[PDB]
Symmetry: D2
Subunit: 217 residues, 4 copies
C-alpha cells in the first residue's frame, strides 16, 4: 500500500521481518515458536519499554521506499542507524518534480505578499532552474555538474531499511512539533505503518517511551 504525502511524495512499505512476537522471542532467547500469548507477551513488551530495555526491538526490521523532496531527505538521512540507497543525479537524468507548498502552509504567518503569490514565485523559480538544468544537459555538460543548479525542493527517492528501535527514535524526533512540518507528515505515515505491523510494540511505545507531542492525541 502506498501512502501519498505532500503534493507528489509517498511512503510504501516494501518488506518486513518479524512482528511483536520477534521481540518477545529474542528477549527470552526462546527455543519455542508457538502462537501469541497476549497477556504474558504484552506485559513483557511493556516492561521492556517501561525500563528502556529496547534491544529486543532491534529484531523487527522494515524496508520502505520513500519519495520526498531533497530538503526532507537531508533531515532524514541524519538518522545514521539505518541503511539507505538513493537515486543518484550523477548517473541518471532527474525528473521535473518539485514540492510546491500549498497556500495553507503559511497558516499563522502574516506576510506582505498573498500566500497564492508565494506559491507562484516558488513555481516560477523552479521552472527556470529546471530549464537551465536541461539546457546544460542537452549541450553536453555532464549530469553531475548540471544537477547542481536544481533546488532543494526537487523530489528524490530512496529505500530505507530500519529496525523498530531506530524507527522509535525517528518517531521521537520527527513525529513532534519541533520538527519541520514536511517531515512530520512523513513520520505520521511511517507511524501508521508501524502501528499496523506491530500493534503491541506501538501501543507500549506511546504509553511509555514516546517523547513527541503529536502521536498521542
Amino acid at each position: 500500500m502506498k501512502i501519498d504525502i505532500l503534493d507528489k511524495g509517498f511512503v510504501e512499505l516494501v518488506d518486513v521481518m518479524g512482528n511483536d512476537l520477534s521481540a518477545v522471542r529474542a528477549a527470552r532467547v526462546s527455543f519455542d515458536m508457538g502462537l501469541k500469548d497476549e497477556e504474558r507477551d504484552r506485559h513483557l513488551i511493556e516492561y521492556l519499554m517501561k525500563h528502556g530495555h529496547e534491544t529486543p526491538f532491534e529484531h523487527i526490521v522494515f524496508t520502505f521506499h520513500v519519495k520526498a523532496p531533497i530538503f526532507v531527505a537531508r533531515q532524514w538521512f541524519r538518522h545514521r542507524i539505518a541503511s539507505y540507497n538513493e537515486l543518484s543525479g550523477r548517473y541518471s537524468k532527474l525528473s521535473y518534480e518539485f514540492y510546491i507548498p500549498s497556500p495553507e502552509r503559511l497558516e499563522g504567518y502574516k506576510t506582505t505578499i498573498p500566500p497564492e503569490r508565494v506559491t507562484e514565485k516558488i513555481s516560477e523559480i523552479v521552472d527556470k532552474a529546471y530549464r537551465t538544468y536541461l539546457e546544460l544537459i542537452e549541450s553536453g555538460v555532464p549530469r553531475e555538474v548540471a544537477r547542481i543548479v536544481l533546488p532543494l525542493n526537487l523530489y528524490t527517492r530512496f529505500f530505507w531499511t530500519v529496525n523498530a528501535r531506530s524507527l522509535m527514535n525517528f518517531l521521537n524526533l520527527r513525529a513532534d512539533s519541533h520538527a519541520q512540518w514536511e517531515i512530520q507528515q512523513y513520520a505520521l505515515a511511517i507511524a501508521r505503518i508501524f502501528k499496523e505491523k506491530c500493534p503491541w510494540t506501538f501501543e507500549a511505545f506511546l504509553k511509555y517511551a514516546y517523547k513527541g507531542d503529536i502521536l498521542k492525541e
Copy 2:
C-alpha cells in the same frame, strides 16, 4: 534447520528478510517488483561487489539463534554492527553444559601429557566449578555472584540479527585460518546458510570480496 557445531552447540536460522533481488531493487531504487532476471541481476551483484559498493546488501537481514561457549561468544560479540540478545546468568540458573575439546583438537601439537588426559583434566575442573556454583546457589548466594566461578567453556545462547554486509565482514574475519578453530566452525555453518539463502550474492562475494582463506577451496 538446526546445524550442530562442536560437541553441544548449534546455529539455526530463525527468520530472514530479503534475498538477492532485495539488493538489486535497492541498488536501482526500483518501482517494479517483477521476477528474477538472472543475467542482468547477477551482473549488477558482481559489479557492486567488485567495486565495493556494498550498501545495497544491507537490505538483506538474517536472525539466527546460536548456542556457543562463552569464549566463542566473546569473540562473536566484538562484531558491533549487529543486534544481540543473550541468556543472562543474573536472572536464570545456568545449565551444566560445557565444551570439552575432542582429543583431535590438539592435532599438530606435541604435549607432555596424552591428548586424552587433557580432555579428562578439562572435564574434571568444569565439574568441580559447577559443583561450587550449585553449592553457592543452594546456600542462598545470589545467581549474579555465584555464576562468576563458572569457566569460559560454559555454553550460552543468543539471538543475532545481522544484515548481509555485516555478515560478509564476519565471514572475512572468522571464516579464516587466523581465527580460533572453534569460531571458524560456527562461521562455516553461517556461510552455508548464507549461500543457501542468497546464492548470487554469496558467489559474488567469494569471487571478488572474500578476504579469508577457508571458504574458497
Copy 3:
C-alpha cells in the same frame, strides 16, 4: 590518575579531546575559538540536554584504560557505540588475578553458610582452575585452548574510546540500581572523571537527561 575499583581493578583516563566548549562550538558551527562565556554557553548546554539534541556532545571524546573482571567486561562490551581493544588470552599467558567478593557483598541476603565461607569457596575453586590452566600450558597445550578453564572472575584489561553522548548512555544504564553492583562501581568512577573534565555538560545531564537512580543523591 588511576581510580582503584573492587579488590584489584581500576579505571584510568589515558587521553581526552574537547571539553564543554567543544560541544557549544560544534552546536553553533563556530568560526570563533575564544574563551568560556559561562552564562550563554551554559544555557545552550542545558537547552541541548533539555531537548534531547545531543549530537553536539559527540565531539567530546575520552580514552580510558580499564582493568575489570571478565563478567563485568562482558556487560561493558555490550555498549556497541564505542571502540575497545582487549588483552587476548590467545596470544598471552593470563595472570593469576581474580575478583573475590568481600563478605559485605552478601549484605541483605540470608544464607545457609557464613559469608566468610562463601569467600573461601570462591578463592578455592579459582585456585584449582588456575592450577589446571598452568598444568595444561606447561604441558604444551595451546594457550587459546587452555584458557577456556578459567572462570569469569579473572581480571582482564582493555582500552575504551567513547564520546560523551555514548558515555551518558552508559551512565544511564550502568550507574543505576538495576545494574549489577560490580559494574555500578566502575560507572561511579567513570562519572567522577566525566564530571571533572566536563562539568557543565555533567551538571546539565544530571538535571535533565540522567535516567538512573544513583548519581543524583
Copy 4:
C-alpha cells in the same frame, strides 16, 4: 591551518586526540607511556594494517570544520560512522555563497556551448534563486520554507568528528577517481592533514590497505 578548496570552500582541523603511538598503545593495552620506538612501533602499525586489524586506529580521533557545497556535503554525510553538526537553514538566514565551476571543470567534454557560457548560465540561475529566497524572507515567509528554492551548489558548513579508521574508509571511497571531482578535492586535503598528524599510520595505509587510485602516485 585552513586549506582552501574549490572557489570558496575550506577544510580546517579544529582538534585531534592521539597519534600513531595511540594506536600501538591500544593494540598492546600498554601500561607504559614512554616515547616513540620507531622500529618496533612501525612494524606493529604495518602488521595491523597488512592484516586488517584496524580497530586500534579507532583510538585516534580528529574534528574538522568544513565549508562545502550542499551537493558535496550530501555525499559526505552518507558516511554514517562519524559525528556531524551542520548550520541549519531553518534557524539562520543563509549567505549568498555558491560554487561556480571553473571553465576547466569541463576539460575533456565536447559541448555545444562554450565552457565560459556554462559558467555564466550557472551564475545567472543562482542569482535569480537567491533573489527569490530573499524576496520571500523579507515578505515574512518562514526561513525553513523560503530556503527550499536555493540550489544544491549553495555552500554550507559543518563540524565532523571522525576516527582514523572511518577516515581511512572515507579516503578509500572519496580519494579515488570514481568519486565526483569536487569531493575528491576535499578528500585530498583531508589526506594531507592525516599524513601530517599520523605519518606512520598514513604510510602504512598507502602501502597495504588504500584501495583508491589517486593518493599513491
